[PDB]
Symmetry: C2
Subunit: 160 residues, 2 copies
Amino acid sequence: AMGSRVVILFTDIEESTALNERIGDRAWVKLISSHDKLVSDLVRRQSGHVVKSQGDGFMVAFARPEQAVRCGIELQRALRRNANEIRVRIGIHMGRSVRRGDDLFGRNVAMAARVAAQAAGGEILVSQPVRDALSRIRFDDGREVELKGFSGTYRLFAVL
Amino acid sequence: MGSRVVILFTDIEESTALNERIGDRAWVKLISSHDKLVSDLVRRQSGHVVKSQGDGFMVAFARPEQAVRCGIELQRALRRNEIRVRIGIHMGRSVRRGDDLFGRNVAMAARVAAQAAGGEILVSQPVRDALSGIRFDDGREVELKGFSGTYRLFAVL
Ligand SMILES: [Ca+2]
Ligand SMILES: [Ca+2]
């Protein structure tokens, strides 16, 4: 089979451009640097690696889905603690994808990005394969969506 | 808010549908050759690829004519070859740290590219004004997400 199994987590900040415009570039560079360090550290704690990041978005790879979910939960908790300003959406999907360079390519990379794009600020959504892989962490009963660039319907599950 | 820089974004129109159509094997081959093409052409105009992810590139140039020429050669090259790519170009101060670019003008460049049609090179008004060899349309006025008001964007003819 083409490619290797990987669990891909995408995250990005809700309305980051408006935030940047509000607080100005000096404050934004500090904010996004602090955020990057936060994400990086929490990823490393779950034996993940940040594959790509640009602006307010990150693509992260894990070997096991429980690591990816644990990382998301800790990130959302950490962001809530900080707020006591920044909300992030998190999406997780797993499947085979092709490593080329220090990037990942293939339909399951794109799918992971769409699972994330479906998530509200403050929310962690996972694809059905992730939910099913973790069925033995708690999930809602899912909602049915259609993902940009893909035919058919997909059920996405919120982490509780 | 950092050094003056010209920022070019490009990305493939509906790459996901494309991937699903030809399959991963074919897609990885396609995007690998596309990456080679873009990298080649950027270097030809003294640009520097700052970030690339999936079907997209963020590119830095010193001068707006370099960015526009690069965009023109890339569209021409792609025609000689199906994929359509959006190209957007903006200029302004951006913070350049750790081999990356930060700030509102990076976001603005991405918004300009996102407004471009496949096969189009769209530039912001500061880029058009700096180039006053290169011909533009009369512009179109649009809202860009995250920014207040409207912006006039100009296609390269
Ligand atoms: Ca965002
Ligand atoms: Ca695209």
